[PDB]
Amino acid sequence: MKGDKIVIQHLNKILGNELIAINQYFLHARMYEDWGLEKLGKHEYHESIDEMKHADKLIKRILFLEGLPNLQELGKLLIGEHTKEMLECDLKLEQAGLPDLKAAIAYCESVGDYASRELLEDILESEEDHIDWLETQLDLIDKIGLENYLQSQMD
Amino acid sequence: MKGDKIVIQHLNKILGNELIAINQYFLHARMYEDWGLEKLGKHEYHESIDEMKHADKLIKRILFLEGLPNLQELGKLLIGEHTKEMLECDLKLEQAGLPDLKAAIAYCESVGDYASRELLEDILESEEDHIDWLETQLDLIDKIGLENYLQSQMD
Amino acid sequence: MKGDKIVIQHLNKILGNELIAINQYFLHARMYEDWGLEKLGKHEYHESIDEMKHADKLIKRILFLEGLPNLQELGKLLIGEHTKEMLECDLKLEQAGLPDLKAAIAYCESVGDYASRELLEDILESEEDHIDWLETQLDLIDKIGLENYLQSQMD
Amino acid sequence: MKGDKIVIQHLNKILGNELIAINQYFLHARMYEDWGLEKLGKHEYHESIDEMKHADKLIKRILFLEGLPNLQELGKLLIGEHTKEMLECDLKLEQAGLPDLKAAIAYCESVGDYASRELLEDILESEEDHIDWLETQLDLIDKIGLENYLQSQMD
Amino acid sequence: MKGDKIVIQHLNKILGNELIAINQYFLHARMYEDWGLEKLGKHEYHESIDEMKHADKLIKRILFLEGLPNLQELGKLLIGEHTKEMLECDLKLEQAGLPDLKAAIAYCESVGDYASRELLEDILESEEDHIDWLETQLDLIDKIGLENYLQSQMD
Amino acid sequence: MKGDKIVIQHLNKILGNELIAINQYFLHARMYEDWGLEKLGKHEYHESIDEMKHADKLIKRILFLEGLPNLQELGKLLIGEHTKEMLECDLKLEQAGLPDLKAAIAYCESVGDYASRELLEDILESEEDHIDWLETQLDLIDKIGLENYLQSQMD
Amino acid sequence: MKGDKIVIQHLNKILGNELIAINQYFLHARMYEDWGLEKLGKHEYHESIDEMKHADKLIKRILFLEGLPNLQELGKLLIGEHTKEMLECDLKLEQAGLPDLKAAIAYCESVGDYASRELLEDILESEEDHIDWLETQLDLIDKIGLENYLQSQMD
Ligand code: HEM
Ligand code: HEM
Ligand code: HEM
Ligand code: HEM
Ligand SMILES: [Fe+2]
Ligand SMILES: [Fe+2]
Ligand SMILES: [Fe+2]
Ligand SMILES: [Fe+2]
Ligand SMILES: [Fe+2]
Ligand SMILES: [Fe+2]
Ligand SMILES: [Fe+2]
Ligand SMILES: [Fe+2]
Ligand SMILES: [Fe+2]
Ligand SMILES: [Fe+2]
Ligand SMILES: [Fe+2]
Ligand SMILES: [Fe+2]
Ligand SMILES: [Fe+2]
Ligand SMILES: [Fe+2]
Ligand SMILES: [Fe+2]
Ligand SMILES: [Mg+2]
Ligand SMILES: [Mg+2]
Ligand SMILES: [Mg+2]
Ligand SMILES: [Mg+2]
Ligand SMILES: [Mg+2]
Ligand SMILES: [Mg+2]
Ligand SMILES: [Mg+2]
Ligand SMILES: [Mg+2]
Ligand SMILES: [Mg+2]
Ligand SMILES: [Mg+2]
């Protein structure tokens, strides 16, 4: 079914964001495991698979709407060098993508593509949760100290 | 453990190849499913997951060797527009990568990084299998005809 | 138990035929599977196993009759290059041999080696089946066309 | 996937060795059982099967590499007349072949056919094992005497 | 159903042979157990029950053919005094009966009593196996020595 | 099977290193347990057992090659007095043994003892893993402090 | 808890004897296995493990008593070249260590280290059991002959 040109453009924009998250989180996930911080690596890993599922949903929607998915463009990955910076980079990435998801939902609504809006709504609800976990870890670090926090992420 | 500079460089090259394969196959996988070719989609999908595992192993090895994994650079995906073309694009991708894996195995041997060579050999074996499956599909299209081949890929 | 000289010679002759069949069908089996024709590969593989079993039975009988089994001689192998040809070559073998089993049975009866006759009897009944199956495949190719036939042998 | 002509030639040479082993062991196995040496018969039988599996793997690799399997030529079979001799004949074959697998692995290395090398390595590890068992049986005969050794192979 | 007079005479001849085997093997079986050679006694015992089943089949066939079974005539039992002689006596008995079974099958064929021939065929196949086991034990005795052989027959 | 003289020397060299590791890791494991650092104790213990298994494999290969395993010369054990130092002693031992293993693999490859090379490659993979774990524990101590690190090792 | 200096010296002496036994028996175990004497190998193997457990108990006791376990000194291994010699080597070892164990027990009693005495009594009971088995094997060899004995150790 021929979809709205601007909607497909919006969906592709979002897909691009997801692909960046996929790579960033997978790399951060393995860096954590490499450092022996198994709990962070596991969670970071799960988030990576989550973003992978988000991208998959966008890809399927774009193809149904008869658009051409863009798996070619890969934006700037924000790779940190230590735990605090890595959590901040992931937080910065998620927060940098919100205006995009909200702008996409708003556009879909304006053109009546209610099903695309629903898909984006599900993704947004998940992104606000990831931001929640991230903000929480950063706050935990400040309340208990970096050494205790990292100690708690070992097993 | 500080790894050999040229070996890590080789591992990053291969990683870049795997990342390309990941994206190309996942897009082809969903394009197949989108067209109702379930069997091709399922097989294409699993190949994508396999390349994902290959990339994961390289990333883990690079980090142990104290190198910096490059998930930032993404080569040109070869996206086909119809089945025969998609099969040929995937075959071409795997064939362009062989010289790379063999060159890496050869280099690892020359410098004594036998563990890295073993990882690469495991990937090479899998790669020669995918090429086998791909060459086989193209040969099948030739023997039974495109219409019959696509019919056989529906369920 | 000293067996009849001519019977043992007949037995060794049939054994040579079996060893030929074993190798021919095993090569054909792997060629089919190499081309992605699983169904043909499975059947041919089973037939190869059946011939192996026949050879085993002849070998055992020969040894009991105090003769020397000859696994040294291997007659011409009739290797085909395509499905239709491979089917015809296998059919030719199952036929070129038929007169041998019948002649051995006739000889055993004439010299009173009723046990050897029964063993050959069992093999004969099985041989007339591989032939039945082979004749059927060729007639099937004629009724539905090579492309449809090959398609049906993929999975 | 076209393989190196010399590699395929080596593969065919090894395949010829395997086919000789298969037949020699199958005959020895049935000779053992015919004499009431059940244990010896079972081992030889299994060893015959393993050689069949080796031949099968070579045949598959050759086909994939786009070469033509030679199941036609069968070399000299070394048939023994009694236990001690049969063990020695099997040992010669298992040794005489060693140079071959080692030469093939060496050639595969030099031309970068690492997958073929690994297939040959698997077979090689197994061959050094059949040799071990054979050398042991002969050393055992020397330590306990032929009469005791044969008694121990009855049931 | 009125059977052929000569066939019934042949069947009675065979029954007589079976009855001799029954008694000879049962006696030899218990002598073995009496000497503590449980493995020989068990096998010898099983053979006795086997001959008992052969006789039973002949008896049933003779009665259907409306003949009078002769359980009255009992030929000369060949009782040995030691293991080697006992195995030879059993061997001599089985070999002395073959010409009779083969002559019976030949006669049945000449007069069209195909069902009687089938019954005799089953018995012949079993007798050639008993002869096999016997010849084997005698050969085993010569290869490993009488003391080792008897030792192996204790449990 | 008479193996290469220098290969055997190489294998005995690696065996010598393994024996040192066995004793060093076992004493360290029991020291950790004695101090109530159960987790560290369990891990050190299992590494001790893995080194015992490496020694075993080397001994078996040396015997097969008809060489004489040397379990008489015990090299210098590097025994620590506190966690940080024990991890460092184990790391130093592991690092000192790498050049030997790689030199042995290189030599086996040069004379065609491909099976010995494989055994050594297996051991090498395990050694690099232990080094990875060791380096990680030391990095962890520096990131969360020794007190936290040790607390996490109590159970 | 600070242990008696001389008690610890005795414990280290016994530990040294255990370390000799461990290596001697493990090598003998694999030699038996190497020659196909599985039964002897399995037993020798288990005894090697029992000595490993004795050493473990000694090490733990020494550490509790705040002494330094000595795993650096390795005494003269008594390696045999054939079964009878290996059994005698192990017997000589066990016999040589017996006076040492009894001297250690006597000393512990004199200084009131009853728990250390308990541990030594447990080990002594086990050592006298190995001596019993060893003496019995050598007596069995004289009673049934070396050839029969070795035959019985194959499985
Ligand atoms: C940096 C590139 C990537 C890496 C390193 C990676 C790695 C992985 C790994 C290790 C798994 C687990 C597979 C398993 O063990 O079963 C996985 C699963 C998967 N990936 Fe990726 N992946 C990458 C990119 C992608 C992309 C771009 C997509 C989407 C187009 C994607 C979609 C999926 C899906 C759908 C699954 C299965 C998720 C599930 O369990 O439901 N991946 N990936
Ligand atoms: C020429 C003499 C041969 C004889 C007498 C023989 C006999 C046998 C027998 C009796 C079996 C076991 C069947 C069963 O019980 O299911 C067997 C299995 C098998 N044979 Fe052969 N064989 C021969 C040659 C070969 C050759 C030349 C090949 C390869 C081209 C081959 C490949 C196989 C395979 C792959 C199996 C499967 C075994 C398993 O998966 O466990 N055989 N053979
Ligand atoms: C020397 C004379 C014989 C002796 C010592 C003898 C002894 C035995 C013994 C001990 C059994 C096992 C019974 C049980 O424990 O269940 C048996 C079974 C039997 N006997 Fe006999 N028997 C003799 C003669 C015969 C004869 C002459 C015939 C045939 C007319 C015969 C036919 C059978 C049958 C049919 C069975 C059962 C076999 C089965 O299990 O299928 N026996 N006999
Ligand atoms: C200080 C010297 C040694 C000590 C204290 C020691 C200790 C141990 C302990 C406590 C076990 C576990 C036994 C159980 O509870 O089942 C064991 C197992 C084992 N040890 Fe040792 N050992 C030593 C030396 C060796 C040596 C030198 C070898 C051989 C070259 C060796 C080979 C083995 C093997 C194969 C096992 C069994 C591993 C398995 O579970 O698969 N050990 N050892
Ligand atoms: Fe997302
Ligand atoms: Fe997110
Ligand atoms: Fe890959
Ligand atoms: Fe691939
Ligand atoms: Fe056949
Ligand atoms: Fe056939
Ligand atoms: Fe082989
Ligand atoms: Fe072999
Ligand atoms: Fe009978
Ligand atoms: Fe009989
Ligand atoms: Fe090791
Ligand atoms: Fe290690
Ligand atoms: Fe002990
Ligand atoms: Fe002991
Ligand atoms: Fe004996
Ligand atoms: Mg559509
Ligand atoms: Mg590290
Ligand atoms: Mg390898
Ligand atoms: Mg015979
Ligand atoms: Mg019939
Ligand atoms: Mg192909
Ligand atoms: Mg009636
Ligand atoms: Mg040996
Ligand atoms: Mg303490
Ligand atoms: Mg007490």
Among protein residues, the one with the nearest Cα to ligand 4's atom 2 is F23
**Cβ-based contacts of C150 with chain B (< 8 Å):** 140, 143-144
Q: Measuring CA to CA, which residue among A71, C129, E145 is closest to residue B24?
A: A71
Verify whether ligand 3 is closer than 6 Å to residue E70 (CB atom): no
Q: Using a CB-CB distance cutoff of 8 angstroms, which residues of chain D are in contact with residue G147?
A: 143-145, 148
Residue D76 CA to residue D19 CA, distance in Å, equals 11
Q: Report CA A77 to chain centroid distance, whole Å.
A: 12
Residues in chain E: 155
Domains located in chain G, CATH noted:
1-155 (1.20.1260.10)
Residues in chain C, overall count: 155
Mutate which: F1, F105, F109, vs D, most D CBs within 10 A: F1
Of C128, C149, C127, the residue nearest C139 (C-alpha): C149
The token pair at F30 is 């029991």
| Sign of the dihedral defined by the CA atoms of residues G121, G127, G133, G139, in that order | negative
**What is the number of the ligand 1 atom nearest to the C-alpha of B55?**
5
Distance C47 CA to ligand 9 centre (A): 9
Determine the Cα–Cα distance for residues D140 and D151; give it in Å rounded to an integer: 13
In angstroms, the CA F27 to CA F21 distance is 10
Name the experimental technique: X-ray
CB D12 within 8 A of CB D61: no
Contact E30, E43 (CB under 8 A): no
| Nearest residue to E46 via CA among E32, E64, E65 | E32
How many other C-beta atoms lie within 10 A of the C-beta of residue G142?
10
Query: Is E122 an 8 Å CB contact of chain C?
Result: no
Contact G12, G67 (CB under 8 A): yes
G61-99 burial string, b = 16+ CB within 10 Å, else e?
A: bbbebebebbbbebbebbbbeebbebbebbbebbeebee
- Give a three-class secondary structure readout of G70-125: CCCCCCCCCCCCCHHHHHHHHHHHHHHHHHHHHHHHHHHHHCCCHHHHHHHHHHHH
Show the DSSP H helices in F3-113 as ranges. 5-34, 38-64, 83-110
Return the residue matching tokens 């002598």: E31
Ligand nearest to the CA of A94: 6
Q: Does G49 contact chain F (CB < 8 Å)?
A: no
CA G66 centroid distance within chain = 25
Instruction: Round to whole Å and give the CA distance between G24 and E63.
Output: 76
CA–CA gap between residue G74 and residue G76 (Å, rounded): 7
* Half-sphere exposure in the Cβ direction for G139 (13 Å, CA): 6
Buried b (16+ CB within 10 A) or exposed e, A116-148: bbebbeebbeebeebbeebeebeeebeeeeeee
3-state helix, strand, coil in chain A (%, to 5): 80, 0, 20
Dihedrals phi, psi of F142, to nearest 5 degrees: -70, -25
Question: Which residue shows structure tokens 């040790």?
Answer: F150
- Pairwise CA distance, residues A67 & A8, whole Å: 6
DSSP letter assigned to residue C2: P
> Which residue matches tokens 């735990």?
A83
Cα G116 vs. chain centroid, distance in angstroms? Answer: 18
Cα F60 to Cα E12: distance, rounded to the nearest angstrom: 66
**Resolution for this experimental structure (Å):** 2.0
3-state SS assignment for residue A64 = helix
For A131, the enclosing helix (H) or strand (E) is helix A114-144
Give G135's contacts (C-beta < 8 A, 6+ positions apart): G91
> Looking at this protein, which amino acid is placed at residue C116?
S
CB contacts under 8 A, G 66-95 vs F, are 69, 71-72, 74, 76-77
Q: Which two tokens stand for residue C87?
A: 């089917």
Distance CA D97, CA E83 (A): 46
SS3 C87: helix
CB C3 within 8 A of CB C69: no
Q: Token pair for residue B48?
A: 């994508």
Spatial separation of the C-alpha atoms in residues C45 and C48, rounded to whole Å: 5
Dist. CA E131–CA B35, nearest whole Å: 70
Whether residue B146 lies within 8 A of chain C, CB to CB, comes out as no
Does the Cβ of E5 fall within 6 Å of ligand 3? no
Amino acid at G59: I
Task: Return the half-sphere exposure (C-beta side, CA atoms, 13 A cut-off) of residue F151.
Answer: 10
CA-based nearest residue to D143, from E40, C51, G81: G81
Q: Tell me the residue type at C51.
A: E
Cβ–Cβ under 8 Å, residues A87 and A134: yes
CB neighbour list of residue F15: distance below 8 Å, 6 or more residues apart: F55, F58, F59, F62, F69, F70, F71
Tokens of C8: 């043992």
Residue E129 C-alpha to ligand 14 middle, in angstroms? 8
Nearest 5°: phi and psi at A37? -100, 70
Query: Would the CB atoms of B77 and A71 count as touching at under 8 Å?
Result: yes
What is the amino acid identity at position G21? A
User: How far is it, in rounded angstroms, from Cα C143 to Cα D55?
Assistant: 37
User: Are F64 and G34 an interchain contact pair (Cβ–Cβ within 8 Å)?
Assistant: yes
The amino acid that residue G141 corresponds to is: I
Residue whose Cα lies nearest atom 42 of ligand 1: it is A52
Cα angle, residue F110 at apex, residues F109 and F111 outer, rounded to 5°: 95
List Cβ neighbours of G155 (8 Å cut-off, separation of 6 or more). D152, G38, G39
Residue with tokens 């030739």: B142
Inter-chain touch F118–D105, beta carbons under 8 Å:
no
Residue with tokens 């220098």: F6
3-class DSSP state for residue D68? coil
For D130, G104, G116, the CA distances from G119, given in Å and listed in that order, are 46, 11, 5
Locus of tokens 């004594």 = B112
Of G26, G69, G74, the CB nearest to F74: G74
The tally of CA atoms less than 13 A away on the side-chain side of residue F10 is 25
**A146 C-alpha to center of ligand 7: Å?**
38
F69–G33 CB contact, under 8 Å: no
The answer to whether the Cβ–Cβ distance between B106 and D118 falls below 8 Å is no
8 A C-beta contact, residue F78 and residue F93: yes
Dist. CA E33–CA E11, nearest whole Å? 33
Q: Looking at A15-133, which runs of residues are DSSP E strands?
A: none
Q: CB of E56 closer than 6 A to ligand 3?
A: yes
- H or E stretch including A60? helix A38-64
Residue D153: list chain E partners with CB under 8 A.
none
Q: B106 CB near a chain F CB, below 8 Å?
A: no
Query: Could you tell me if D154 lies within 8 Å of chain E, comparing CB atoms?
Result: yes
Closest Cα to residue F3, out of F77, F128, F102, F104? F104
How far apart (Å, rounded) are the C-alpha atoms in residues E37 and G22? 44
Instruction: Tell the residue number behind the tokens 């009894």, with chain if given.
Output: G102
d(CA G28, CA G16): 19
Amino acid at G9: Q
Q: Which atom of ligand 4 is found nearest the CA of G26?
A: 29
| Residue contact B137–C36, C-beta within 8 A | yes
**C-alpha dihedral sign at G1, G4, G6, G11:** negative
Amino acid sitting at position D102:
K
Find, among G76, A74, G121, B150, the residue nearest to F74 by Cα.
Answer: G76
CB contact at 8 A, D104 and F112: no
